[PDB]
């Protein structure tokens, strides 16, 4: 997987301080509908690798990070730019739709 896995511990280096925008997928190990977005994210990570990084955070095992960023529904996607959560996406989408939301902030 072109996507990366992040934790509470790794979040600051992996996501926050990244000079490249990161799309973070807040998901649950025990939620099946929350895993539906994974393949699409995988396609995106490979296809748009120069423009964007894709990260996956398991809210089940990293509760504080999920709470700090105020994730209320799963799956949730938050785009991080220069350390800030600049974009929040709820309701799982198709690829074209997801890419359209992201284009406002990401080139290509
Ligand atoms: C709720 C209950 C469940 O059994 C699986 C995970 C969940 O948190 C979610 N359910 C849905 C259903 C539709 C879309 C998204 C989610 S998350």
Swiss-Prot record:
It comes from the Bacteria. PROSITE patterns: THIOREDOXIN_1 (PS00194), THIOREDOXIN_2 (PS51352). Pfam families: Thioredoxin (PF00085). SUPFAM superfamilies: Thioredoxin-like. GO terms for cellular component: cytoplasm; cytosol; extracellular region; peptidoglycan-based cell wall; plasma membrane. One of its GO terms (biological process) is cell redox homeostasis. Disulfide bonds join 31-34. Keywords: Disulfide bond, Electron transport, Redox-active center, Transport. One of its GO terms (molecular function) is protein-disulfide reductase activity. Residues 1-107 form the Thioredoxin domain. Belongs to the thioredoxin family. Participates in various redox reactions through the reversible oxidation of its active center dithiol to a disulfide and catalyzes dithiol-disulfide exchange reactions. This is Thioredoxin. It comes from Mycobacterium tuberculosis (strain ATCC 25618 / H37Rv).
